[PDB]
Amino acid sequence: LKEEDLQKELQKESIKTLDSKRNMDSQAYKKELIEQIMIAQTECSLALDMTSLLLSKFKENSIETISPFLKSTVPPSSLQFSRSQPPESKESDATLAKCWKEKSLTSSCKFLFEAKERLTSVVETEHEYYTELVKVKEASWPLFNSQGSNHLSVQYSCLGGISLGLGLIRMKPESKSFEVQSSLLYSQAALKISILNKDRDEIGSSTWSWPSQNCNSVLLKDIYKLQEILFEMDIWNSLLQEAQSCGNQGVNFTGDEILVPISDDHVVRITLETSSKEKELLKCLCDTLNAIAHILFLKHCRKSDRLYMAIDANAPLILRPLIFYYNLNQESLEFQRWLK
């Protein structure tokens, strides 16, 4: 409720058959049910009690069957029964019975009709979903049933990398279109490599773009973008643990990004760009760095797990080669500058 909205509505109102005609909770259905079975139980319990009273006059069997409240309240051997004559049958009563059964059958056959119709809608959607899953695995993407046991998940991280990521296909029914949901927390992910001058302004940077091969189905595009994102995440993580091992070379990881000092009081800044949901030569250098960083990651993936004295052999080795060759260049340049 807002005063402006209301002054608008009320200002709009200032502008303006004798019979009055006017036209749920699972807990509520629950209450209706327990209510009904309870009334049944009270009726049956009554009949039980009464019969138990009589037979208890004539047997041990029914002192047991009578309720403790009733047997406490009333003395046993209370009721009686005598031979008598059964009542005249009511014509209305039998015609009632027949009317009841006929209505019962018609009810049943109608219910089978509508149940068939709803289950046919169900089987229809099912057929839709599974034709799309078939479309997917026809493209040789593996899929596994999800942990919830509802639907199925595609393994977008099936080309490579360290982490194994899979995400379930769900039908968005309102749009009648399929969507791939993943544990991943990033709408976008890409490795940014950059160079920082003395004043910390960014001289150049590279972020890979993927080849974006043509794909026919929305679902497969979403798959590719997920796979890409997670792969980038794999690279950033690997770079990080690398930086743990090789701090002595100067690689510094602030929580926000990796940076590496460089010979002319410049810095390289390696970040992961994310959404949550001479200048030409130098850009060649950045792009070169990103590309080679890549390739080297990939090499780390090919390796099989199983010399030197470095602290961690299992540490990947992307930074360290890159900075190795950089440093060979720089040493050589200093040498030649002396000789010149």
């Binding site: 009563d93 039998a94 009632l96 019975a97 027949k98 009841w100 059964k101 006929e102 019962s104 059958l105 009810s107 049943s108 219910f111 089978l112 149940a115 289950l119 169900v122 089987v123 099912e126 599974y130 899953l133 695995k137 493209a139 040789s140 993407w141 593996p142 899929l143 596994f144 049933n145 199925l152 099936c158 080309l159 080849p211 091969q213 043509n214 794909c215 497969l220 060649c284 250098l285 070169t288 080679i292 060759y325 060979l328 260049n329 050589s332 340049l333 030649q336």
Partner: protein
């Protein structure tokens, strides 16, 4: 643990058990509706339980059918769970041009450096 073949046959005997159980309840339920459909004895007190039974049996039939749908789904999933893909999507066709990468590598590595011939 059980053999591999033991696992397979275990599964199929399970799927059967479930599935002939569901069909059999479809048959038997329809049968017993039929057994109850005649209104000759027509004790109105007997007719009313009969009405309940009819409703309960038809619902039990639909239940069984839905059970069949559960089974068929499971079978599809199993078929899709099988690791027979043996391939990758592979969308390739953007060419390496390696010799260019060699030359750009060297070019960068020798920045501001006077080079000489091998020996």
């Amino acid at each position: 643990s059980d053999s591999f073949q033991r696992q397979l046959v275990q599964r199929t005997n399970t799927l059967n058990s479930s599935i002939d159980n569901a069909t059999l309840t479809i048959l038997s339920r329809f049968q017993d509706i039929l057994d109850i459909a005649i209104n000759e004895g027509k004790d109105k007190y007997t007719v009313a339980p009969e009405v309940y039974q009819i409703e309960c049996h038809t619902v039990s039939m639909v239940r069984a059918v839905e059970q069949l749908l559960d089974v068929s789904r499971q079978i599809k999933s199993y078929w899709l769970t099988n690791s027979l893909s043996t391939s990758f999507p592979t969308v390739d066709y953007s060419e390496p041009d390696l010799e260019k990468v060699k030359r750009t590598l060297t070019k960068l590595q020798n920045h501001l450096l006077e080079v000489s011939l091998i020996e």
